[PDB]
Every structure is written in C-alpha cells, then in structure tokens.
Amino acid sequence: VGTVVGIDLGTTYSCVGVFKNGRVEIIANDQGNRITPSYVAFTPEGERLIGDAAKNQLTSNPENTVFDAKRLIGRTWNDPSVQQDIKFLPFKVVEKKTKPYIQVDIGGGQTKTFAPEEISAMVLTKMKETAEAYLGKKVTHAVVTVPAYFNDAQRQATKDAGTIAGLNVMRIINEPTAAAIAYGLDKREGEKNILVFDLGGGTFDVSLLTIDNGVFEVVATNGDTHLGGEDFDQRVMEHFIKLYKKKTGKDVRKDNRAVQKLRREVEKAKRALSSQHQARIEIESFYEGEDFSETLTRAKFEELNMDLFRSTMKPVQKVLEDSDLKKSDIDEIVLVGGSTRIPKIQQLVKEFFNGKEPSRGINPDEAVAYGAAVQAGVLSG
Numbered sequence: 430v431g432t433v434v435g436i437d438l439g440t441t442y443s444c445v446g447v448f449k450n451g452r453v454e455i456i457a458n459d460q461g462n463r464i465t466p467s468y469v470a471f472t473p474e475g476e477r478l479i480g481d482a483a484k485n486q487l488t489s490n491p492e493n494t495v496f497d498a499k500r501l502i503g504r505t506w507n508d509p510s511v512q513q514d515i516k517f518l519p520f521k522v523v524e525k526k527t528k529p530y531i532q533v534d535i536g537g538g539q540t541k542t543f544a545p546e547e548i549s550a551m552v553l554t555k556m557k558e559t560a561e562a563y564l565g566k567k568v569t570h571a572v573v574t575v576p577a578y579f580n581d582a583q584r585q586a587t588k589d590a591g592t593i594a595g596l597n598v599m600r601i602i603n604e605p606t607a608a609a610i611a612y613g614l615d616k617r618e619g620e621k622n623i624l625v626f627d628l629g630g631g632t633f634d635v636s637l638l639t640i641d642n643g644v645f646e647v648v649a650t651n652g653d654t655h656l657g658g659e660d661f662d663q664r665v666m667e668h669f670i671k672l673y674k675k676k677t678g679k680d681v682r683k684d685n686r687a688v689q690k691l692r693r694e695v696e697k698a699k700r701a702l703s704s705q706h707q708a709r710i711e712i713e714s715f716y717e718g719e720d721f722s723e724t725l726t727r728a729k730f731e732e733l734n735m736d737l738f739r740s741t742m743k744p745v746q747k748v749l750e751d752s753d754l755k756k757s758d759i760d761e762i763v764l765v766g767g768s769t770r771i772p773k774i775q776q777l778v779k780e781f782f783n784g785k786e787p788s789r790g791i792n793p794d795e796a797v798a799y800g801a802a803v804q805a806g807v808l809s810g
C-alpha cells in the first residue's frame with residue numbers, strides 16, 4: 430500500500446493529507462495552496478488545466494470549463510436532480526450510457542465527452558500528484574471522502590474516479606465523520622450526539638451523527654445543495670457591479686473577463702475579511718481600459734449576506750426535529766467547510782446553541798481531508 434493518502438474530493442475545493450512522522454500533514458499544491466479547486470479547463474493549444482490554473486484561466490468561454498461534476502457523479506442522466514442542476518451549468522451535459530456526460534471543446538475544434546467520474550478522476554490525479562511531489566514517491570492507495578447522503582452508485586462512481594486516476598480507493602468514508610475523526614471525537618467514552626455544520630463553496634450540509642464505542646452512525650442529514658460561499662461572493666459582486674454602474678454609467682457584465690476578474694478579487698477579499706476588518710479590491714484594465722479600486726469592510730460584507738447567514742439555521746433545526754433531539758442534546762458541534770471561517774458564521778452557530786463552543790483547532794476546509802489522513806495513517810502502518 431505504501432503511503433496511503435487522505436483526499437477530500439470536494440464539490441468546489443479538494444484537499445489532500447498524509448500521516449507522516451507522527452502527525453497529519455496537509456499538502457500544498459504546486460501553486461502553494463492547501464486546497465485545490467475541483468476545476469478543469471483547456472488552453473487554445475489543447476492542453477488540459479486542472480485546479481488553480483483552470484479556475485484562474487481568463488476566458489470568454491465558460492462553456493469549455495468543467496466544475497461541480499460532484500453534483501452529477503453516480504447519477505443517471507434522467508435523475509431530476511441532474512435535470513435541475515444542468516440548468517445552472519454553463520457547459521454541455523448530454524445523455525450517454527444512461528449518464529450525464531460532459532461535452533466540451535478543448536482546442537482546435539476538438540470536442541470531447543467525459544463521464545462525471547472522468548472529470549473527478551482528473552481532480553484526483555491532481556491531488557495524487559500534489560501528494561507525490563510532497564512525498565518524493567508514487568502514491569497508489571487512498572482514503573476518499575464523500576458526503577453523508579451519498580448513495581450506492583455515487584460511492585461506487587467515486588471509487589471508479591479513483592481507479593481511472595490510478596488510485597485504489599481502500600475506503601470511502603463520510604465527510605462529516607472524517608471531520609469528527611480529525612477532532613478525535615471517536616476516541617471518547619459514552620454515547621454522544623454530534624452536529625456537523627458544513628458550509629462549503631456551493632453547498633450547505635448539516636449532519637447529525639452519534640458516536641458510541643468508536644462507531645459513528647449518521648442519524649440524519651439536511652442542508653441546502655445550492656447555498657454556500659459562492660452565494661456570498663455573488664452578493665458582493667452585485668454590490669460592486671451596482672456601485673461601478675452608479676459611478677461610471679457602465680454595466681461590467683457585458684464583459685465576462687471583467688466579471689471573472691472581479692469574482693477572483695472578491696473571493697480573495699472575502700477570505701481576508703475572515704481575519705481582518707477591511708480589504709481592498711483592485712483591478713487594472715478592469716473595464717474598457719479603466720481601473721477598479723474599492724474597499725470592503727467586514728461589516729459591509731456581513732450586511733450584504735446577513736439574511737443568507739441566518740437561513741443556515743433552518744436546516745439545523747430540521748435535523749434536530751427529525752432526530753427527535755433538542756439543542757441541549759448536542760454534545761459536540763463541529764464546523765466544516767471554508768465558509769465556517771467567517772467570524773459571523775461562527776458567532777451565529779454559537780448563538781443557535783446558546784453559547785456552546787464548537788470544536789476548534791483544525792482549519793475547517795482542511796478537517797475532512799485531515800480525518801481521511803488519520804485513517805490513511807493507520808492503513809499505511
């Protein structure tokens with residue numbers, strides 16, 4: 430088996446970890462990031478880009494980039510969830526062998542058609558290479574996580590993505606369970622109720638788990654499949670786009686490269702606002718030669734998104750009701766996902782649970798891969 434890797438195969442961002450010299454190491458990719466976008470695109474010369482290079486390639490053709498393949502993996506073409514999701518995806522999705530294959534132009538007029546698990550295999554190949562460059566050797570085996578609501582076909586298709594990527598997926602484990610492992614909540618006495626609050630890029634997941642004698646049970650899951658940090662970005666996009674139009678009379682949405690540039694700066698500013706109170710957004714040659722310079726306060730970021738922040742509490746209340754539990758029955762609160770780095774998110778979760786502190790100490794966008802890596806450690810021996 431060699432050194433087994435723990436991979437979080439995320440809808441929006443993936444993360445890879447290994448156990449080495451007595452601890453979990455989360456590995457940075459060749460762009461220096463400890464997370465990688467689950468994103469594929471193509472150069473004019475027909476080269477395939479994956480991760481940060483794909484997400485950051487300036488394009489006037491969103492239809493030939495691929496992302497959110499996790500929404501389609503292990504589902505049939507005619508799944509109503511698929512037929513709803515393809516409405517919001519700019520790339521072509523076509524029925525093939527019962528499944529929603531993704532069709533794109535890659536360069537020189539060449540069309541390709543890819544199974545969702547082929548797209549996921551590319552993301553896994555990238556996570557595999559990130560780990561190999563770190564380890565200085567080949568990696569053949571992995572622990573891969575999936576969302577708790579994944580069914581049999583989704584779990585199998587994730588394993589198949591692994592196979593295509595040259596990885597033997599030895600274990601598939603649930604994301605909120607991996608988070609809980611990362612916090613060592615498995616190494617505890619008695620039966621406990623754990624609420625995992627996972628607010629990611631495009632998805633919100635709430636999972637109620639019980640732990641007893643080292644064994645986790647998923648009691649209930651809920652959330653919103655189209656709610657996450659991307660929606661907070663978009664509220665900021667709208668704010669600056671309206672402002673620019675007020676200041677200049679120009680509507681920047683006419684230029685996609687401009688919108689792409691502002692989205693990238695907005696996403697970055699949002700992250701900085703998790704640890705500081707103000708951030709500058711600056712773009713030269715933003716629109717029709719003119720530059721862009723604005724600041725965003727934390728307070729303004731919260732004001733723009735407050736309603737969306739509060740809406741995350743409703744699926745939590747729902748999982749409690751379905752599990753026949755009240756707030757005081759929850760023994761552990763685990764924050765997962767990049768958006769839970771938002772101080773306001775943490776505050777509102779803590780206030781939902783009447784002042785109770787969540788687990789702390791692992792980066793929430795890293796916890797899932799951390800847990801995977803813990804198990805990978807054991808399997809590596």
Ligand SMILES: Nc1ncnc2c1ncn2[C@@H]1O[C@H](COP(=O)(O)OP(=O)(O)CP(=O)(O)O)[C@@H](O)[C@H]1O
Pocket residue numbers: 438439440441442443464576604627628629630631632633657658659696699700701703765766767768769770771793794
């Ligand atoms: N410091 C920070 N502050 C605020 N948001 C941050 C952040 N760092 C990352 N994010 C946000 O985290 C989101 C990505 O979250 P995450 O990687 O958990 O999603 P995911 O791909 O795991 C979803 P799923 O769990 O469905 O697979 C993005 O919206 C990103 O902008």
Ligand SMILES: [Mg+2]
Pocket residue numbers: 439440604627629766797
């Ligand atoms: Mg996640």
